[PDB]
Design a binder for this molecule. Structure first.
Ligand SMILES: *[C@@H]1O[C@H](CO)[C@@H](O[C@@H]2O[C@H](CO)[C@@H](O[C@@H]3O[C@H](CO)[C@@H](O)[C@H](O)[C@@H]3O)[C@H](O)[C@H]2NC(C)=O)[C@H](O)[C@H]1NC(C)=O
Ligand SMILES: CC(=O)N[C@@H]1[C@@H](O)[C@H](O)[C@@H](CO)O[C@H]1O
Lengths: 49, 49, 49
C-alpha cells in the first residue's frame, strides 16, 4: 500500500489525479554515459478520493 | 478467420532502454475443439542494435 | 560545407584540392566524442559515422 494525498492545508481532502512512479534507476550511476538511467519502472496511477 | 489475426504491441511497456536487455519471442497457438496446443519459438532471437 | 539528405538519403559533393597526397574524410549529423569517463563503460552508446 502506498498512500498519497496532496491537501492544501492538510485538513482538506481535495480532488484531482496523482501518479506514483518508482524506478530501479541505479546503484552509483555516473550519468556521463547519457543513456537513460532507469533500470526498472512500475508506474501506478489513480484519481484522488 | 477474417483476413487473419494481427497484433500491435507497444515497445514502451517493454522499456526499450539501453540496460533493458534482449528480448525473446514465443507464441502459444492454442487450437479449438482439439486442445493439443502448439507452441513455437520463431523470430525469437532478438537483435541487439 | 554542410549539406543535407536528398530523397534517397544520398549526397554528392566536390571538395577543394591543394593539399598533400593523404586525405581522410568523414561527415556527421552528430559530433565526435572520444569522451568516456571510465575504462569499463559497460554503459555504452554509439552512432555510426
Ligand atoms: C577549389 O575550387 C575553386 C573553384 O571554386 C578552384 O579555383 C579555380 O582555380 C583555377 C586555377 O587558379 C582558376 O583558373 C584561373 O585562376 C586565376 C586566379 O588568378 C585567374 O586569374 C584565371 O583567370 C583563371 O580563372 C579558376 O578560375 C578557379 N575556379 C573558377 C571559379 O573558375 C580551385 O582550383 C579548387 N582547388 C584546387 C586548387 O584544386
Ligand atoms: C498504431 C499502430 O499499430 N501502428 C501502425 C499505424 O500507425 C498505422 O496507421 C497502421 C496502418 O496499417 O499500421 C500500424
Amino acid at each position: 500500500n502506498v498512500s498519497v494525498c496532496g491537501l492544501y492545508t492538510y485538513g482538506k481532502p481535495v480532488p484531482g489525479h496523482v501518479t506514483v512512479s518508482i524506478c530501479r534507476k541505479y546503484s552509483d550511476a555516473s550519468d556521463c554515459h547519457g543513456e537513460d538511467s532507469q533500470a526498472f519502472c512500475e508506474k501506478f496511477s489513480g484519481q484522488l478520493n | 478467420s477474417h483476413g487473419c489475426f494481427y497484433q500491435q504491441v507497444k515497445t514502451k511497456v517493454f522499456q526499450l532502454k539501453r540496460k533493458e536487455y534482449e528480448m525473446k519471442l514465443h507464441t502459444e497457438a492454442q487450437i479449438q475443439e482439439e486442445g493439443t496446443v502448439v507452441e513455437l519459438t520463431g523470430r525469437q532471437s532478438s537483435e541487439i542494435t | 560545407s554542410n549539406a543535407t539528405t536528398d530523397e534517397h538519403g544520398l549526397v554528392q559533393f566536390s571538395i577543394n584540392t591543394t593539399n598533400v597526397m593523404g586525405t581522410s574524410l568523414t561527415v556527421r549529423v552528430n559530433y565526435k566524442d572520444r569522451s568516456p569517463c571510465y575504462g569499463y563503460q559497460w554503459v555504452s552508446e554509439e552512432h555510426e559515422e
